Amino acid sequence: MESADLRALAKHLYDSYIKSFPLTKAKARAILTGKKSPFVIYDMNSLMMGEDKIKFKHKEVAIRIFQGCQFRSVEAVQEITEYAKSIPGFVNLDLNDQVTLLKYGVHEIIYTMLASLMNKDGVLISEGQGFMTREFLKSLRKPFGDFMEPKFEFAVKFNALELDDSDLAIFIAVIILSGDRPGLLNVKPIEDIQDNLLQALELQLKLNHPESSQLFAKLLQKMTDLRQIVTEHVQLLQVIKKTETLHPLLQEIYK
Amino acid sequence: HMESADLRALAKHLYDSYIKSFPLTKAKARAILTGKTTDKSPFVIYDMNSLMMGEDKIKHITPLQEQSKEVAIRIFQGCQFRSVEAVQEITEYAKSIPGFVNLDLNDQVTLLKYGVHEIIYTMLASLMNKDGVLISEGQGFMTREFLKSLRKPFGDFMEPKFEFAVKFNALELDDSDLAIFIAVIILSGDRPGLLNVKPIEDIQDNLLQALELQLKLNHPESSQLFAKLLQKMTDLRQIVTEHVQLLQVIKKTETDMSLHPLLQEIYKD
Numbered sequence: 001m002e003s004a005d006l007r008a009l010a011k012h013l014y015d016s017y018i019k020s021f022p023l024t025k026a027k028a029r030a031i032l033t034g035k036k037s038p039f040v041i042y043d044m045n046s047l048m049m050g051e052d053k054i055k056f057k058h059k060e061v062a063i064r065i066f067q068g069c070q071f072r073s074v075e076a077v078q079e080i081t082e083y084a085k086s087i088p089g090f091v092n093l094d095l096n097d098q099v100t101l102l103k104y105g106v107h108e109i110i111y112t113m114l115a116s117l118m119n120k121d122g123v124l125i126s127e128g129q130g131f132m133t134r135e136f137l138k139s140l141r142k143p144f145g146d147f148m149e150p151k152f153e154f155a156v157k158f159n160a161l162e163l164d165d166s167d168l169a170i171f172i173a174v175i176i177l178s179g180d181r182p183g184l185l186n187v188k189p190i191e192d193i194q195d196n197l198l199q200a201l202e203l204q205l206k207l208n209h210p211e212s213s214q215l216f217a218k219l220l221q222k223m224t225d226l227r228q229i230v231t232e233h234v235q236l237l238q239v240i241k242k243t244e245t246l247h248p249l250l251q252e253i254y255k
Numbered sequence: 256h257m258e259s260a261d262l263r264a265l266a267k268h269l270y271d272s273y274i275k276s277f278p279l280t281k282a283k284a285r286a287i288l289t290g291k292t293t294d295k296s297p298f299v300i301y302d303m304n305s306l307m308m309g310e311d312k313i314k315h316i317t318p319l320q321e322q323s324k325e326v327a328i329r330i331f332q333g334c335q336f337r338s339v340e341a342v343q344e345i346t347e348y349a350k351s352i353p354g355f356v357n358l359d360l361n362d363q364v365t366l367l368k369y370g371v372h373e374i375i376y377t378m379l380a381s382l383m384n385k386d387g388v389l390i391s392e393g394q395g396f397m398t399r400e401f402l403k404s405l406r407k408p409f410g411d412f413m414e415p416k417f418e419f420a421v422k423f424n425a426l427e428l429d430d431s432d433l434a435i436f437i438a439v440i441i442l443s444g445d446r447p448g449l450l451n452v453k454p455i456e457d458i459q460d461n462l463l464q465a466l467e468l469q470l471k472l473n474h475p476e477s478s479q480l481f482a483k484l485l486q487k488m489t490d491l492r493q494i495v496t497e498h499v500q501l502l503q504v505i506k507k508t509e510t511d512m513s514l515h516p517l518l519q520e521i522y523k524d
């Protein structure tokens with residue numbers, strides 16, 4: 001791998017990233033900074049008017065928001081799955097291995113890209129047409145409030161790295177091509193592709209962030225953390241499932 | 256209107272997802288049904304003794320939970336168990352259809368509620384020939400004659416599935432064709448109670464365009480196969496109506512039958 005191949009890979013992934021996801025970090029940041037104001041949900045009354053205003057496809061209030069998070073996450077899985085097919089070499093892997101990589105990767109990627117939509121005060125929703133405040137989400141009763149706040153806690157730290165969309169496109173691909181997912185049949189071509197993506201990410205960060213020392217290592221430290229965050233997350237889901245309890249078809253969609 | 260390249264890309268995406276979503280392809284089923292090999296041969300159940308031997312040899316033929324029960328019920332619960340698994344597989348497939356998960360959540364449920372039976376019949380035909388049906392992921396083959404001879408209302412409950420399959424199979428569709436066909440069925444804007452008919456019809460229009468092109472390229476010598484296949488998607492509507500009528504009648508008489516909650520909810524209204 002020469003620098004030319006690595007820059008070509010970075011640009012290929014960037015181009016696909018822009019086409020795959022509805023709201024880029026660049027567009028999200030302009031909305032969060034104030035550079036039409038989004039509709040703000042900050043309490044129960046503004047939530048009621050906002051689902052009238054924005055027609056959330058995404059009934060006690062805390063559950064309604066929780067189920068809105070689930071609807072959006074399912075959409076993100078399909079967006080990530082389509083993005084994965086643009087990663088060079090991915091569609092040539094064993095079909096079972098494509099499925100395994102996506103199954104075990106989507107949660108880490110959803111957390112990562114959710115950070116593009118958050119600041120310390122709230123989160124963009126409905127392709128940036130809405131903004132739900134952190135204080136509102138944190139204040140939800142039962143375990144739902146403590147279910148929402150860890151997402152903000154991660155995003156504030158992840159966003160301190162100041163990654164842009166061209167960095168994130170490669171980073172997300174690196175996550176997908178993880179050779180240690182349980183049950184992979186042919187680890188060799190997965191790690192070979194991840195080695196190319198890691199080389200491209202290293203060069204991208206040195207060129208795009210020349211003054212950010214060891215940003216490559218700090219970002220790998222983060223992709224690491226994501227493993228533990230996601231495991232905390234699935235555990236919190238199992239606690240809710242036994243405590244709160246949906247049409248059987250709906251259970252299948254969200255399984 | 257989308258371009259030929261986009262339509263071919265959609266066909267390939269759906270075929271890929273279909274291979275990933277469904278455990279036993281028509282291609283694999285036909286390789287088993289044709290034989291000529293040693294490693295793939297199924298064990299054939301055609302009577303009581305071979306059913307007994309098959310539960311010893313073979314993915315349980317019939318659920319072990321029903322082992323104390325009369326044979327017709329045991330076989331029925333084997334069908335329902337697999338149908339429930341099919342609902343789960345179809346739901347997974349549906350999520351891969353571009354645009355499906357972006358629909359109103361109520362409409363997603365409604366499309367699946369009304370679509371799964373038609374798809375199950377369609378895909379069951381892949382596992383059938385005129386003499387029987389592959390079971391246990393193709394490890395077994397149960398004969399049409401054995402199923403038809405089941406007592407009470409069960410024998411005549413089984414036979415219409417074969418009657419449809421022989422006619423559907425004469426179209427000689429392959430998995431790449433079926434993957435688009437099944438997506439067309441799911442995205443039907445005429446299902447009762449849909450809230451947002453327009454975005455569903457928009458997706459089906461692209462799927463129909465893709466199916467039309469797929470059949471012209473894959474079956475260039477089969478005149479008006481597209482129209483013949485739409486004529487089939489029609490019949491399924493009445494075939495499924497006969498099925499649900501028979502099932503509700505049988506359920507009232509056979510206290511030993513159980514419906515999985517997933518199926519139970521689908522059959523309500």
Ligand SMILES: O=C(O)c1ccc(-c2nn(C(=O)c3c(Cl)cccc3C(F)(F)F)c3ccc(Cl)cc23)c(OCc2ccc(Cl)cc2)c1
Pocket residue numbers: 056058064065066068069070071072073074076107110111113114117123124125126132137147148151
């Ligand atoms: O646009 C997007 O890219 C996007 C992506 C992720 C989330 C989101 N997921 N999520 C999870 O818990 C979750 C996660 Cl991280 C990973 C896998 C599965 C889950 C699951 F399934 F459990 F849901 C959240 C929890 C809290 C918050 Cl603030 C947000 C989310 C998101 O939420 C917008 C939203 C919020 C409220 C309402 Cl009413 C409507 C939309 C948007």
Ligand SMILES: O=C(O)c1ccc(-c2nn(C(=O)c3c(Cl)cccc3C(F)(F)F)c3ccc(Cl)cc23)c(OCc2ccc(Cl)cc2)c1
Pocket residue numbers: 316317329330331333334335336337338341372375376378379382388389390391397402412413416502518
């Ligand atoms: O592999 C698969 O994709 C597959 C898919 C569908 C069926 C199957 N469903 N079915 C229905 O009546 C039924 C239908 Cl169509 C739709 C919804 C609900 C029902 C319900 F609940 F009423 F059962 C059948 C009746 C007769 C026959 Cl021959 C087959 C089936 C299937 O049966 C394999 C089998 C046969 C015998 C034994 Cl012992 C074990 C397995 C396989």
